[PDB]
Every structure is written in structure tokens, then in C-alpha cells.
């Protein structure tokens, strides 16, 4: 959470990232959310909600894998599917 705070603050420095942020906020939302509400929603975060959301968006998905180059070592897709969900090893 402290890394996300510092990353967002150093992300929005200057004028170009600020104006880009205003444009992208008013395109996705029609409005701009200032960073204090982002700080409050950072304070709305504990590890239990995090592992709930990660259980929602990772736990036995059907991912998209793109390989480029000498990718002989890269396993088959079913190896990714087996190692995706834990059987608690």
C-alpha cells in the first residue's frame, strides 16, 4: 500500500501525466477522482479482501499465454493449468 501510494504520487508529477490522468479519468468515468479518495480506498484494504479478489481473478482461470523466441523450455498449456490451482501441494 505504501508502494502504491508512492508510485501514484511519483506517477502524477509534472503537467503531462496530470493532464493525461484528467483525460483518462473523464473518459472512463466522466469525472475525476482525486487522490484522497484513492488514499481512503487504500485504507479500505486488508489481506482478506485481497485474497478474496485474487481468488476471484486467478483461481483456475483460462489464461492467455504468448511465447516469443526460443521457447522450447516453455511448458504446454495444461502444465500452466495444473500449476494454476493449488491442491495445497
Amino acid at each position: 500500500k505504501n508502494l502504491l501510494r508512492n508510485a501514484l504520487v511519483s506517477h502524477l508529477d509534472g503537467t503531462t501525466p496530470v493532464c493525461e490522468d484528467i483525460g483518462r479519468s473523464l473518459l472512463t468515468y466522466g469525472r475525476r477522482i482525486p487522490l484522497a479518495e484513492w488514499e481512503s480506498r487504500i485504507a479500505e484494504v486488508d489481506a482478506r479482501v485481497v485474497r478474496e479478489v485474487c481468488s476471484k481473478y486467478f483461481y483456475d482461470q483460462c489464461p492467455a499465454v504468448a511465447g516469443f523466441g526460443p521457447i522450447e523450455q516453455l511448458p504446454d498449456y495444461n502444465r500452466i493449468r495444473s500449476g494454476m490451482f493449488w491442491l495445497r501441494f
Partner: protein
């Protein structure tokens, strides 16, 4: 039915194993009754239970 079943009994491994052992015992019981009923049903008559039921 399917969404309910996957959302309950297919996301924790140990609960999955426990419920398939419980259902395996229940299916073992039901298959005992079904198979014994069928095999006694297609060979009625010459079976020892009725000849013992004579006596």
C-alpha cells in the same frame, strides 16, 4: 445445479475429497441395494433365501 455445484464443491481440495468420500459411501450403499435387487430379480426361484424360508 452446475454453477452452484462448481461454486461450492470445486474450489477447496480437502472439502472436495471429503464430500466425494461421503457420496462414495452413499453411492456404495445405493449400488449394493440396486445390484442385489437386480441379481435376485432376474434369478428368482432357485435362490437359497426362499428354500430357507420354507423351514
Amino acid at each position: 445445479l452446475t454453477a452452484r455445484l462448481y461454486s461450492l464443491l470445486f474450489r477447496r481440495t480437502s472439502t472436495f475429497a471429503l464430500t466425494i468420500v461421503v457420496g462414495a459411501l452413499f453411492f456404495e450403499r445405493a449400488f449394493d441395494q440396486g445390484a442385489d435387487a437386480i441379481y435376485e430379480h432376474i434369478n428368482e426361484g432357485k435362490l437359497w433365501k426362499h428354500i430357507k424360508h420354507k423351514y
